[PDB]
Design a protein around this ligand. Structure first.
Ligand SMILES: Nc1nc2c(ncn2[C@@H]2O[C@H](COP(=O)(O)OP(=O)(O)O)[C@@H](O)[C@H]2O)c(=O)[nH]1
Ligand code: ALF
Ligand SMILES: [Ca+2]
Ligand SMILES: [Mg+2]
Lengths: 337, 769
């Protein structure tokens, strides 16, 4: 009476699997708000973790992030007319520019030595401080610091390294995850203006909207239109989706992301500059965060829709477990009852 | 190194020495074989002192050595020296097969002079004939081909004869004479122009004067060129970023045209330094840009083998053949070993083999259609030919569909040897250690079986199902080679699907497969996700006719077999769709048709959730050089996808009469709602009056760019036609429903929507509060 009662339990196992329902969650936002980095974390925690086969899939992209980040650096030295300090970097600078970005698999003597050299130039470092003026990805600083580990012949990026890669999402992809008692179908979408036209095709039967804003957007301008503030788009793009008829009985969750970079960027760039009506202190980690939070929660036409909001850090695996544990509950307790 | 321009190395340019030989005319002539610099033609001095040229894009295969064709007349053998001393005479043999379709193919045989000159030629000439860029090249390039032909075909006195041109563009005579006189090249005396005063530029001004283009002028008037003559750098840049771009693509991944880039276009295209010095582009330079290398209809990423090849075998459509041995009608026509070579050279990956018992005197199994007055080619010759050309066009797995009728362990064991003897390592005798043959274990990827061959036979007379109905019982020898493609009798979808074996697969005849499409379609898709399914045409089709394969692709069938013998609408499509993904014959299904969690209805009349549906508009503008004769032309524009998407009704009027440079001002042909674009395919086709075919082109709805483009037409077997080409305008965009227009607008620019509507609620406040 073991093998008979074994397949009674296996029956009741597949019972709960097929008998539970799934809930469709949309991850929306403006360009580079950290939407794909969020899914990677959900894959880390509640999905298939990253194997060493998977980790070397990105080893090619990690190289291409350095070049794209460096190519755009050297163009800013001409844009802003920033002079190079050391003159033997002018030979290396010409060499890096003329490299194709797309066809880059290896990382060798000819360039590794050159890129190392360019990162130590004062003119280039002065350029990094002024990266709010041109377009440069946030992960740049992380990678160029440890060029030595990357230059290694047998380099395999850690899970931390795979969150930081910059691979821009396009279209509409549907990643499902199992959370034991309920399935979460999480739709990732593109953030830029071309990609928002597409969104419409996945609004039907939406349970919740995990909107994503990047706190450090407040001084930057859009890549799609260099004439406008990034935070002001997020502000308005949120306003829009809250009005929509579709999402009448759908919960709204506001992730104020890239919280770490706000503490960095606040101690020199001021929030009083770009959003005048801020009565709080300057160089403020806390209240500068809080002014932003209320700025979004006050753009609420529905006086009854309670907007559940968490500040987050999308590159930290252990911040998301905390935040998603609560978001998991907030959701489940609003649908099941 | 993905796709490289077809460079012709040193030896081919100046050309080595050969001996052309023919059987039926008993010819044995010396020839200096030569390929021109740009890789257009293969030419030589003929016996008549005529310049006989061969089109490189019509080369199907080049065979060298033992695989080369050998002479079958006794006296021809001896005059080459086959009854001689050396065992060297195979190292200099080269056979160049050429033709438009695989049925009609003339063979040109050659013999070299020097040791190993013949070897290097074969393989280098092969890479020219099958290069991708070469075939999919620009409109500019295709005209130069036309120029290269006229320069090559010279007469006894070493000149370009007048009539040569009159018969190429034989869509007019009277005009052409005034056009050449306008150029100042005296054709008046002995009706032949010298090759000196006939440079590329002279040929250019010839057509500009001969071929008047009013359509290009209207298009100039549009883009702010109301001050007619020229276009500024800004007008050109903005024109490209508003019209010529594809609005579906991302802005960060595919960026718009910068001003510093737009400069390089003018430099490359505008001949006048009068205008290049001023950062301007004339009408003459614009006509070129339109037909240039950048402004093609398709992007390179489409033609390249750039689709993922790591998914399960079942998640791909596969190019497949039915009764491949046959070359004519299904009944009394003849069979041929050669058709198997040609089939695999197409890009086909699944080929059928109806093997049979031997004869009492000898004991050789042979291939033929079940007793039906068909010629009987032997098995060994077929297997050897497959072993040759299986991995020439595409280095991806091939499926030998064994329809076994061999009724003796004696001769059935013999074919077990033939496979291992001929193919050797290529034959997949045992399973891979990664994917075993268990229940629930998915099929390996195409990449996991690169350069391998898989047998398809059983393991351990019907009116319309044919000789495939009464297949003989497999024996213990043949069953060893079978593994990942196991044909079994089909019961029902639940039964074969809940069994959970993936390697198992069932074949379906057209009619039985058709009912399953109508009676249980979603059940079909969800079987095809996991397992395989073959579809062969019914026995009613006794003249090798083809059914529409799109029918069964819609529900996820992989091996949708066809008769390669005939090239009707159906086969015209199969041909043109497998051109993509680098001629590999493996096209990866759309997301939802191969995903376990998702499930959609192939018949849905409304947009699906998740799937980004598109909207397409096609306006036919004009055409050039569409005939060797004055006659009316009309154009068809059809779409093949899901039934919901499929329309094939649109058609232009018959042209004014001019087959030289006709212009159609007609309402655009709208496809307002394409539910599943990833599966759907556009199809432009040009015809003369009274249905005479001219040239068609198959384009995928997914990749097609928006804007003014030329569309280089092809023959029925998707080989590039030189002169004929249409000018068309396109608008592929992401589908917004009619009701949600303003909603979709807000999302694209919420800075304005928030403001301009908030502003209202503000300035309305003093009226209430
Ligand atoms: N420092 C920091 N960087 C982040 C965070 N979240 C995302 N990023 C980075 O910002 C970039 C944008 O992320 P991604 O998900 O690609 O943006 P999306 O295209 O809007 O989904 C990536 O290169 C990430 O490494 C965060 O919480 N902190
Ligand atoms: F800005 Al994204 F995927 F949303 F690159
Ligand atoms: Ca058959
Ligand atoms: Mg993303």
């Amino acid at each position: 009476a073991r093998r008979i009662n074994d397949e009674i339990e296996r029956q009741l196992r597949r019972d709960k699997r097929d008998a539970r329902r799934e809930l469709k969650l949309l991850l929306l936002g403006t360009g580079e708000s950290g939407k794909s980095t969020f899914i990677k974390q959900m894959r880390i925690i509640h999905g298939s973790g990253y194997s060493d086969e998977d980790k070397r899939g990105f080893t090619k992209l990690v190289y291409q992030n350095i070049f794209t980040a460096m190519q755009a650096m050297i163009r800013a030295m001409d844009t802003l007319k920033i002079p190079y300090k050391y003159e033997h970097n002018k030979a290396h600078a010409q060499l890096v520019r003329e490299v194709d970005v797309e066809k880059v698999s290896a990382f060798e003597n000819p360039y590794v030595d050159a890129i190392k050299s360019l990162w130590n130039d004062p003119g280039i470092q002065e350029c990094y401080d002024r990266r709010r003026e041109y377009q440069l990805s946030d992960s740049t600083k992380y990678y160029l610091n440890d060029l030595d580990r990357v230059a290694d012949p047998s380099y395999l990026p850690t899970q931390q390294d795979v969150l930081r890669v910059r691979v821009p999402t396009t279209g509409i992809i549907e990643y499902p995850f199992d959370l034991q008692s309920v399935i979460f179908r999480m739709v990732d979408v593109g953030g830029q203006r071309s990609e928002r036209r597409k969104w419409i095709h996945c609004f039907e039967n939406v349970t919740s909207i995990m909107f994503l804003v990047a706190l450090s957007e407040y001084d930057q301008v859009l890549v799609e239109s260099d004439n406008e503030n990034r935070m002001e788009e997020s502000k308005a793009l949120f306003r829009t989706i809250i009005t929509y008829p579709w999402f009448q009985n759908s919960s709204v969750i506001l992730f104020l992301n890239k919280k770490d970079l706000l503490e960095e960027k606040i101690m020199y760039s001021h929030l009083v500059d770009y959003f005048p009506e801020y009565d709080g202190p300057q160089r403020d980690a806390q209240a500068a965060r809080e002014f932003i939070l209320k700025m979004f929660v006050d753009l609420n036409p529905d006086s009854d829709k309670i907007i559940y909001s968490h500040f987050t850090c999308a590159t930290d695996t252990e911040n998301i477990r905390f935040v998603f544990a609560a978001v998991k509950d907030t959701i489940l307790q609003l649908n099941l009852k | 190194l993905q796709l490289e321009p077809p460079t012709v190395v040193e030896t081919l340019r100046r050309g080595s020495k050969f001996i052309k030989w023919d059987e039926e005319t008993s010819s044995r002539n010396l020839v200096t074989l030569r390929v021109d610099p740009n890789g257009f033609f293969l030419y030589w001095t003929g016996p008549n002192m005529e310049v006989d040229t061969l089109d490189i894009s019509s080369i199907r295969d080049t065979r060298t050595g033992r695989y080369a064709r050998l002479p079958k007349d006794p006296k021809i053998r001896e005059v080459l020296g086959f009854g001689g001393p050396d065992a060297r005479l195979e190292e200099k043999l080269m056979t160049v097969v050429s033709g438009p379709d695989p049925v009609n193919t003339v063979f040109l045989n050659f013999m070299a002079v020097q040791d190993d000159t013949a070897k290097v030629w074969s393989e280098e000439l092969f890479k020219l004939a099958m290069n991708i860029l070469a075939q999919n090249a620009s409109r500019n390039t295709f005209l130069r081909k036309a120029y290269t032909k006229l320069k090559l075909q010279v007469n006894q006195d070493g000149r370009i004869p007048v009539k040569n041109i009159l018969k190429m563009f034989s869509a007019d005579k009277k005009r052409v004479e005034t056009a050449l006189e306008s150029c100042g090249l005296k054709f008046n005396r002995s009706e032949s122009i010298r090759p000196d005063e006939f440079s590329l530029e002279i040929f250019e001004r010839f057509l500009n004067k001969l071929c008047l283009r009013p359509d290009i002028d209207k298009i100039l008037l549009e883009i702010g060129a109301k001050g007619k003559p020229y276009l500024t750098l800004e007008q050109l840049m903005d024109f490209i970023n508003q019209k010529q771009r594809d609005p579906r693509l991302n802005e960060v991944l595919y960026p718009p045209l910068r001003p510093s880039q737009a400069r390089l276009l003018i430099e490359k295209y505008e001949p006048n330094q009068q205008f290049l010095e001023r950062d301007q582009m004339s009408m003459e330079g614009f006509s070129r840009y339109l037909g240039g290398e950048e402004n093609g209809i398709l992007p390179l990423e489409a033609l390249d083998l750039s689709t993922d090849m790591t998914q399960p075998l079942s998640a791909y459509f596969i190019n497949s053949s039915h009764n491949t041995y046959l070359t004519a009608g299904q009944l009394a026509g003849t069979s041929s070993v050669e058709m198997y070579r040609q089939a695999l050279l197409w890009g086909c990956r699944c080929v059928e083999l109806d093997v049979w018992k031997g004869r009492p005197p000898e004991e050789e199994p042979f291939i033929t259609h079940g007793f039906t007055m068909t010629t009987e080619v032997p098995l060994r010759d077929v297997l050897e030919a497959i072993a040759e050309t299986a991995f020439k066009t595409s280095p991806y797995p091939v499926i030998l569909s064994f329809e076994n009728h061999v009724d003796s362990a004696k001769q059935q064991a013999k074919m077990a040897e033939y496979c291992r003897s001929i193919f050797g390592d290529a034959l997949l005798i045992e399973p891979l250690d990664k994917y075993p043959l268990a229940p629930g274990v998915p099929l390996p990827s195409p990449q996991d079986l690169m350069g391998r061959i898989l047998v398809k036979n059983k393991k351990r007379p019907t009116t319309d199902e044919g000789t495939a109905s009464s297949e003989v019982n497999a024996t213990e020898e043949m069953s060893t080679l079978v593994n990942y493609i196991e044909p079994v009798k089909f019961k029902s979808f639940e039964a074969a699907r809940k069994r959970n074996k993936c390697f198992e697969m069932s074949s379906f005849v057209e009619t039985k497969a058709m009912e399953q499409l109508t009676k249980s379609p979603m059940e079909f898709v969800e079987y095809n996700k996991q397992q395989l399914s073959r579809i062969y045409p019914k026995g009613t089709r006794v003249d090798s006719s083809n059914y529409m394969p799109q029918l069964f692709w819609n529900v996820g069938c992989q091996l949708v077999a066809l008769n390669f013998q005939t090239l009707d609408v159906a086969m015209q499509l199969n041909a043109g769709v497998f051109e993509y993904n680098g001629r590999s014959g493996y096209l990866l299904k759309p997301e939802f048709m191969r995903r376990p969690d998702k499930s959609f209805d192939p018949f849905t009349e409304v947009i699906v959730d998740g799937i980004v549906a598109n909207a397409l508009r096609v306006k036919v503008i004009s055409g050039q050089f569409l005939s060797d004769r004055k006659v009316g032309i009309y154009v068809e524009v059809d779409m093949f996808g899901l039934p919901v998407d499929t329309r094939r009704k649109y058609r232009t009027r018959t042209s004014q009469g001019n087959s030289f440079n006709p212009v159609w001002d007609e309402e655009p042909f709208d496809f307002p709602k394409v539910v599943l674009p990833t599966l759907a395919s556009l199809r432009i086709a040009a015809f003369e009056e009274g249905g005479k075919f001219v040239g068609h082109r198959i384009l995928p709805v997914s990749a097609i760019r928006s804007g003014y483009h030329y569309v280089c037409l092809r023959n029925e077997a998707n080989q590039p036609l030189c002169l004929p080409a249409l000018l068309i305008y396109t608008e592929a965009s992401d589908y917004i429903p009619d009701d949600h227009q303003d909603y979709a607008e807000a999302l694209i620019n919420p800075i304005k929507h928030v403001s301009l509507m908030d502003q209202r609620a503000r300035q309305l406040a003093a009226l209430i509060g």
